[PDB]
Amino acid sequence: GQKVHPNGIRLGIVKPWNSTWFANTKEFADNLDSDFKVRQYLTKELAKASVSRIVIERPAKSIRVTIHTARPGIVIGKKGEDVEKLRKVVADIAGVPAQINIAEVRKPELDAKLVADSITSQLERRVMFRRAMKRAVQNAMRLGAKGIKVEVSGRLGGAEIARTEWYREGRVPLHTLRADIDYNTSEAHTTYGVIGVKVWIFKGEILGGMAA
RNA sequence: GGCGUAAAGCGCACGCAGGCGGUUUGUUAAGUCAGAUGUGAAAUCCCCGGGCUCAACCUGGGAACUGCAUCUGAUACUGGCAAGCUUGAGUCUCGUAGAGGGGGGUAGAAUUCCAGGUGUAGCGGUGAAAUGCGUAGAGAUCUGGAGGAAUACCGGUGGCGAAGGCGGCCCCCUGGACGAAGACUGACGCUCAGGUGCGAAAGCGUGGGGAGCAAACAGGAUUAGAUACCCUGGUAGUCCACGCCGUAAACGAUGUCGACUUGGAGGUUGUGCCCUUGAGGCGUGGCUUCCGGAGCUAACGCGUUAAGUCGACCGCCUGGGGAGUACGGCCGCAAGGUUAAAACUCAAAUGAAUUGACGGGGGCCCGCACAAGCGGUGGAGCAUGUGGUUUAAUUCGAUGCAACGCGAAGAACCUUACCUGGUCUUGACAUCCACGGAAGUUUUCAGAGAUGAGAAUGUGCCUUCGGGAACCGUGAGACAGGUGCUGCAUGGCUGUCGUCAGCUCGUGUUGUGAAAUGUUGGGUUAAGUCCCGCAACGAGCGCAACCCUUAUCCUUUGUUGCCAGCGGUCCGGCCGGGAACUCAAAGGAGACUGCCAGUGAUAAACUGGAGGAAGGUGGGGAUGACGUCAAGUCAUCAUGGCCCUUACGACCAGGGCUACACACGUGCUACAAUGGCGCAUACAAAGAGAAGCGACCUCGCGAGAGCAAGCGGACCUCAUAAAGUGCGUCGUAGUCCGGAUUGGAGUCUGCAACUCGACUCCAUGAAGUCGGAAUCGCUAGUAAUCGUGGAUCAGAAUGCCACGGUG
RNA sequence: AAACGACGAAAACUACGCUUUAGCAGCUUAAUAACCUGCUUAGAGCCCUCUCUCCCUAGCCUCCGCUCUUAGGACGGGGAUCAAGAGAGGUCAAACCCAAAAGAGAUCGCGUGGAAGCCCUGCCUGGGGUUGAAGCGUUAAAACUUAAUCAGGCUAGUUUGUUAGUGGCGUGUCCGUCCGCA
């Protein structure tokens, strides 16, 4: 192991949590079990939709999952029927009634999860990894990101020996703890194994710490 | 085309034939140049046309047949002839330097022997030793004598010589080179296949010489072996004269001569003139060294002494091995030399340079890596894991540093895969289904249970009622399943170098090009941290900072946390009350080389100090680059093929992971008078608690048992911390030391501790009595020594992870 | 052993889409350009949707649950549809935001005085205690009140001990003179 996960090293400084609630470990295990279940159900359901992230709040005898996505229209549906359809299942899985929020994410090519997504789809549909990564990094640089670093490893191009390629633009200060280093992972299930993809997006230096 | 380095300059010099040849005139016109004639067969090629329906094919003419012979001219060049000239070349006259060669003499240093004197137990030698020399007087010292070789300093990138080569001094003969001025000789000039001559050392023959050195050889020594490197002796040889071979990295790996083509710093040796006041200056020659411009080269490098552009000549090269080998001719007393192949094999063999890596290469620097400690490990039981052993299994993985108190943060069945026994074939675990009943709640037997039967039963909520949740049973089919394998297909995660300080990119520049600068060099540092200088200018990953804890102060708000001041007391924070404090957890100030001197390059930076709780990162943690190790996990999980579907899949009972001769690793108890023992007695922090922590009373010698209040926790518990401190007691002891083994009977948790936890009593009292080679961590609240909490956990730490006491 | 790597010259997820300008930025000797561009300002022609502009109604609730209930509200239902238009969006359900009260005391819940069991006590007569067991009423009332009865046929006379006529397997199989439990 070389690099630690850049999210949980600055979660207490500049980055927000993906789950906001409290427990006295009387129900902590079941709360995360419920959070894991709802997260995996949402990920399995909203496959076509480009879901950016899933934040969960758990107030007293209620929950609130605020999904952030790039294209919210598919999840919304006509007259807001699909959200009502997929809200009851979440509510009954979590026990307490739910209230699902949906947030559109501006600049869909500047989110770590979004940029890590659909590159696996390109690999599945047999798009060359080098050109795919180059297009992703150049689009992210053009949109406004100050630094982008993309790594792709494992059975690239259906070869015989796996390797690890990477591209980098601008600056990616992974060691500093006063910058947005939003990072997410994704995997592709090709015809000759599994390919791992990692993306680091440095946007700026957040002075002052948490709460802006 | 090339010959400095890949293959290619004879080792050098002379020189015959031959090749070439300064300058002017006249003559000849042989080559050469112009024109004409004959011939150069036909055929063929080419060009223009035609015929075969096109083409192939045939055909007419033209051109061509690049050649030869003859005739008529041209005269610049080459050639022949005759006259001239000095600029090429050679000679005279005078000086200059020189280890140039041959021959003969002379003088010391030094080594070795002979003889003598003084003198006693060592000398010599090696990383260390011995062979060797010594009491028969060694080594050392002094005297005289014998003999051989070379001539310390001068002595240099100095001189001479064609090359080889040449070093005291003197004499005799002689070759060669340069310069000042002077006249003639008049092309007499350069090279050279054959040929001749010289030719390092080693080698051979004859006749001598032989001090030192030294092949062969003898002995000692290291090493597994050492026919060597090392040591002690030692023959040929090295020396002289005449003879023989003609080999070298005979090297400047560069064949001889001519002229042309920028410069600087010298060395040696002449010569002209200037006031020669110093090895003062201005010119001109000969030899030679270093740097370097243009130019050349694949590059290194050459660079007026070209490896720059030419001219004349000779020799050599045509892939690496076979091989400069055999045969053959010649030379030679011989060794051998010279001229010099062929068959067969190979896809390369090569040289200059570039980036890494290595060196028993050099320079500089850092880290408990050594040095100065301290304590332990290895010695003897005790708790663990690994290897092998045995078994049916001792389930599998990790197998150097980076595996061995590892996954496992804790195996009686559970976990659990392995084995012995029994059962199932859509399954324990999903989706699609046709039905019959909601389920479900007690229960009887067989059985170790898995599951085989049997019952009293429930008759749950839902529309038009062939119903739906939902539950089970039967029949399959896809399917489910694998801790089966492939981490040499992988994703993800992790260890190591290493918290070392380096790793790269953009532009520019340099070299054709791999590539280099930037990144090196000088200070400086914890550091690619900074500065300076420099074809470098900037940036990214990086070394730091931002992040967490703690070290001081201020403020905000005082309960469950505190008592500066007062009142009472049940003397206790008890509570009224007091919000300064100890403290609680939020925001700030605060240490930033900031300043003062010295040092340094007028910097960077370093040393000391007035201040501060703090000083150069104040003290710790997190943060672990490019990348290396087919590094470890397909048994956390996912994933591509491969494997089984009556079995590698599914369920249950009992055993095994904890095991008979051992070794290894990491820890604990210790060894004793620094100590254990009996009775009083203070000083902490951090954490846990809801079928859990568990106050008090009573039985208990005891683990604990009935009773249990309080506590989702600054309230109540876990939980009078130990070391120490007070007093006795033990006197260096098979010990009042170590509690390992073993027997008896129990206490708590767990359907159930025989295989296999721990605590408690009684007794028994193994070793040991400071540990061999070789080793491990630590530089300050650190190493040692003492106790406690917490993780998974029904119970199980001597392990792991953190607080503290002393230090 | 082994290990190379050439074409979004398949702009390929489709944001309604397509426009001009306004300025930053890459492009550069230098100011335009092609755009490489993410926005910001403007108009919507338009493919689209929603409140709609139709009428009737006063549809308007909200504190106390409900009952004509008051200040006030941004407050409010049915029906087929459009010519043009006033605003929001682009496959927008909530959230962020903006708000709730004067009522009056009509009622199920909610609280009732002579009643079904449980206390020596197991069957039970047990009122002695009590409710939604019987009269009764609003955010409140006509209030009001779940254990302590002794003792009885009460395991029923042969069950406990004086005690035997046989309606008895007795004793590996036992026919079994006799022993042995009632």
Ligand SMILES: [Mg+2]
């Ligand atoms: Mg050639």
Ligand SMILES: [Mg+2]
């Ligand atoms: Mg050569």
Ligand SMILES: [Mg+2]
């Ligand atoms: Mg060579």
Ligand SMILES: [Mg+2]
């Ligand atoms: Mg030569």
Ligand SMILES: [Mg+2]
């Ligand atoms: Mg020769």
Ligand SMILES: [Mg+2]
């Ligand atoms: Mg002629």
Ligand SMILES: [Mg+2]
């Ligand atoms: Mg002619």
Ligand SMILES: [Mg+2]
């Ligand atoms: Mg024709």
Ligand SMILES: [Mg+2]
């Ligand atoms: Mg002809």
Ligand SMILES: [Mg+2]
């Ligand atoms: Mg002539």
Ligand SMILES: [Mg+2]
């Ligand atoms: Mg002479």
Ligand SMILES: [Mg+2]
């Ligand atoms: Mg010759």
Ligand SMILES: [Mg+2]
């Ligand atoms: Mg000789």
Ligand SMILES: [Mg+2]
């Ligand atoms: Mg000798």
Ligand SMILES: [Mg+2]
């Ligand atoms: Mg010798």
Ligand SMILES: [Mg+2]
């Ligand atoms: Mg001789």
